[PDB]
């Protein structure tokens, strides 16, 4: 058996909502220390990696490793089915045909029990060894989201350019071009609005706006986004959870 209870049901929906577009069939691998999940999209340029630690649940039991594969389209149909104030519990038996999602209300009344049929999928889980990156930055999700959404309107490619104490996003297309230049700053009133930057080397990478427009959906999980770039290597966009993360590894464009 697996019994994992999220304190708020909403969290699981938001988690799935960051992946849900950009990758439809995914294997969730539960074990003693939490659940992890990985998937690559059909064009093989974007890898999504999920890690929910035990500390993110209010109760968690997993007596034996269990892989449960689900269609996320199906799963998110069932996750418009509890209030953002019910508890959600995932329940699975040994070698399961199906996953149970149990939504329960605080006043002992209104149980919603859903049984979702599972799927058979090819489990290429990758031990991703932390690379070192030429640059690291973190900024508000919403700000990053707005930058990407705005520049997308000018082209299918967005170029991220890092120099010392300067981050520059640029898009260039048929109607014209645009650039957003933001500078590191720490505001003590609310340090969630801070923009931070660690640069070893300058970097200059270009990415598909199609992919950035799916990545920015991680904003449902976190106030902030971490972006790690290097010129050799795929970029990491990371959204932190309470004891976990959702990561997106995106291949740059050769131009």
């Amino acid at each position: 058996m697996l019994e994992a209870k999220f304190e708020e049901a909403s969290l699981f929906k938001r988690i799935i909502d960051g992946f849900k577009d950009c990758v439809q069939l995914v294997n969730f691998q539960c074990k003693e220390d939490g659940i992890i999940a990985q998937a690559v999209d059909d064009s093989r340029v974007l890898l999504v990696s999920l890690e929910i630690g035990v500390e993110a649940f209010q109760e968690y039991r997993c007596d034996h490793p269990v892989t449960l594969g689900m269609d996320l389209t199906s799963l998110s149909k069932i996750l418009r089915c509890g209030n953002n104030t019910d508890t959600l519990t995932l329940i699975a038996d040994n070698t399961p045909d199906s996953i149970i999602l149990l939504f329960e209300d605080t006043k002992k009344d209104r149980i919603a029990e859903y049984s979702l049929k599972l799927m058979d999928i090819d489990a290429d889980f990758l031990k991703i060894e932390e690379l070192q990156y030429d640059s690291t930055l973190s900024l508000p999700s919403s700000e990053f989201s707005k930058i990407v959404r705005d520049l997308s309107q000018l082209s299918d490619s967005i170029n991220i350019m890092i120099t010392k104490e300067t981050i520059k996003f640029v898009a260039d297309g048929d109607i014209g071009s645009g650039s957003v230049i933001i500078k590191p700053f720490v505001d003590m009133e609310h340090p969630e609005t801070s923009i931070k930057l660690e640069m070893d080397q300058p970097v200059d990478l270009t990415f598909g706006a199609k992919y950035l427009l799916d990545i920015i959906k991680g904003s449902s999980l976190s106030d902030r986004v971490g972006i790690r770039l290097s010129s050799e290597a795929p970029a990491l966009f990371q959204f932190d959870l309470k004891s976990g993360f959702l990561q997106f590894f995106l291949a740059p464009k050769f131009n």
Binding site: V40, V45, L126, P234, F249, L250, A251
Partner: peptide, 8 residues
């Protein structure tokens, strides 16, 4: 592709 590039 991405699997590969990461593996390095």
């Amino acid at each position: 592709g991405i699997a590969a590039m990461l593996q390095r």
